[PDB]
Amino acid sequence: RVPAFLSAAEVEEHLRSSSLLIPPLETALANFSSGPEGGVMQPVRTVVPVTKHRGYLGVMPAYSAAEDALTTKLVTFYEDRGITSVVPSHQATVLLFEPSNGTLLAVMDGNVITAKRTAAVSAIATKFLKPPSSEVLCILGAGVQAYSHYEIFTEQFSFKEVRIWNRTKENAEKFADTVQGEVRVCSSVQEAVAGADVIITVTLATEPILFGEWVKPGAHINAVGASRPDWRELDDELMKEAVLYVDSQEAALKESGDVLLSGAEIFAELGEVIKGVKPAHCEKTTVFKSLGMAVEDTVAAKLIYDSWSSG
């Protein structure tokens, strides 16, 4: 018995659509937030800073009884060293084990899983915290997460207008050119968020790039970047003013610079909202701080492995 290897291509083929991840993900998020009865054993992510290379190794193990899946995702991301750069990308790989045996069943690309699963979770949050009538969508960033998010948002919702802003203008244009559907390339984040109902922040910025003073009251913001406790994408007033929702409180309190450096108070976990124990103040300016959780990779890894296994 040797572990099977699933290429990125083989994964894209058994996952195929991230909008299909929504249901199993809503379940996982709810189960994760329903404490022990939820069946998910997820310790907070551990990060190993590889300081001499300005990078980080993240390990995300999880067991979920509901679908009886035992996995662990390992990720590596290296700091932006400035605009002309040249940095190595986010890299992930997921390992799936036999829950009863402990045998390593498969090692698979985690890049597409990470792309698709993060976008799906943001979509779930948006479908819950998005305000009454919700016309304009704004995306800050133009990397892997930008595309995955755009893909599922245009599929799951209907925006009269979609905007994008990127520190490097040429990439925001490349984005608008390669994506299906029209997108307005903006030259400043304040122009991009001007009157925006839903905003998505997926950058590698360490200092605030979105200031609450530019945000339209009641807008929902998916804060996906800044997964270190000394990095920020949002301002103190945005963090101050808005009703804060996260995927995991323990994770936020350990990894979100935006939550920590601002001293904002966590209102609830997305899982709580999904199940109904916490209210969705979608009429108020909301912020969903996403850090990523092991169980989210578990449900995906599982789905894929079964699909793969079927042949």
Ligand X SMILES: NC(=O)C1=CN([C@@H]2O[C@H](COP(=O)(O)OP(=O)(O)OC[C@H]3O[C@@H](n4cnc5c(N)ncnc54)[C@@H](OP(=O)(O)O)[C@@H]3O)[C@@H](O)[C@H]2O)C=CC1
Instruction: Report the interface residues with ligand X, using CB under 6 A.
Output: 77, 80, 89-90, 114, 118, 141-146, 166-168, 171, 202-205, 209, 224-227, 290-292
Q: Which of 93, 166, 222, 290 binds a second copy (CB under 8 A)?
A: 93
**Residue 150 vs 267, nearer CB to ligand X:** 150
| Beta carbon nearer to ligand X, 93 or 118 | 118
Closest CA relative to residue 55, chosen from 75, 79, 84, 74: 79
On whether 105 is known to bind a ligand per the annotation, the reply is: no
178 binds, among a second copy, ligand X, none (CB under 5 to 8 A by kind): none
75 in a known ligand binding site: no
On whether the CB atoms of residues 8 and 112 are closer than 8 A, the answer is yes
Nearer Cβ to a second copy, position 60 or 172?
60
Which residue in this structure is represented by tokens 């913001």? Answer: 221
Q: Which amino acid is at 85?
A: S
CB of 96 to ligand X, least distance (A): 19
Among 27, 31, 42, 203, binds a second copy (CB under 8 A): 42
- Residue 17: other Cβ atoms inside 10 A: 12
Provide, rounded to whole angstroms, the least separation between the CB of residue 308 and a second copy: 16
Q: State the binding string over 103-122 for a second copy (x if CB under 8 A, else -).
A: xx--x---------------
CA distances from 295 to 27, 221, 304 (A): 10, 23, 14
- Do 293 and 42 meet the contact criterion of CB atoms below 8 Å apart? yes
**Residue 27 contact, options a second copy, ligand X, none, Cβ 5-8 Å cut-off depending on partner type:** none
The reply on whether position 46 binds a second copy by CB under 8 A is yes
145 binds a second copy (CB under 8 A): no
Task: Compute the chain's Rg from CA coordinates.
Answer: 19
State the CB neighbour count (10 A cutoff) for residue 106: 18
Shortest separation between residue 310's beta carbon and ligand X, angstroms: 28
**Tokens 């945005």 found at:** 238
Is residue 85 within the footprint of a second copy (CB under 8 A)? no
Residues 6+ apart with CB under 8 A from 126: 153, 156, 157, 198, 220, 222, 288
Nearest in space to 229 (alpha carbons), one of 247, 205, 252, 200? 252
| Residue 277 interacting with a second copy (CB under 8 A) | no
Q: Which is nearer to a second copy, 76 or 154 (CB)?
A: 76
Q: Is 180 annotated as a binding residue?
A: no
- Distance between first and last Cα of the chain: 18
Binding-site partner at residue 76 among ligand X, a second copy, none, CB < 5 to 8 Å by type: a second copy
Check: CB of residue 291 under 8 Å from CB of residue 309. Answer: no
DSSP string, 50-104: EGGGTEEEEEEEEEETTTTEEEEEEEEEE----TT---PPPEEEEEEE-TTT--E
Angle, alpha carbons 78-168-142 (nearest 5°):
65
* Interface with a second copy, residue 279, by CB under 8 A: no
Q: Which positions touch a second copy (CB under 8 A)?
A: 2-3, 5, 7, 41-43, 46-53, 55, 57, 59, 61-63, 65, 68, 70, 72, 74, 76-78, 86, 88, 90-91, 93, 95, 97, 99-104, 107
Binding residues for NADPH: 80, 90, 117, 142, 144-145, 166-168, 171, 203-204, 224, 226, 290
Binding site as annotated, residues for 3,3',5-triiodo-L-thyronine: 45, 255
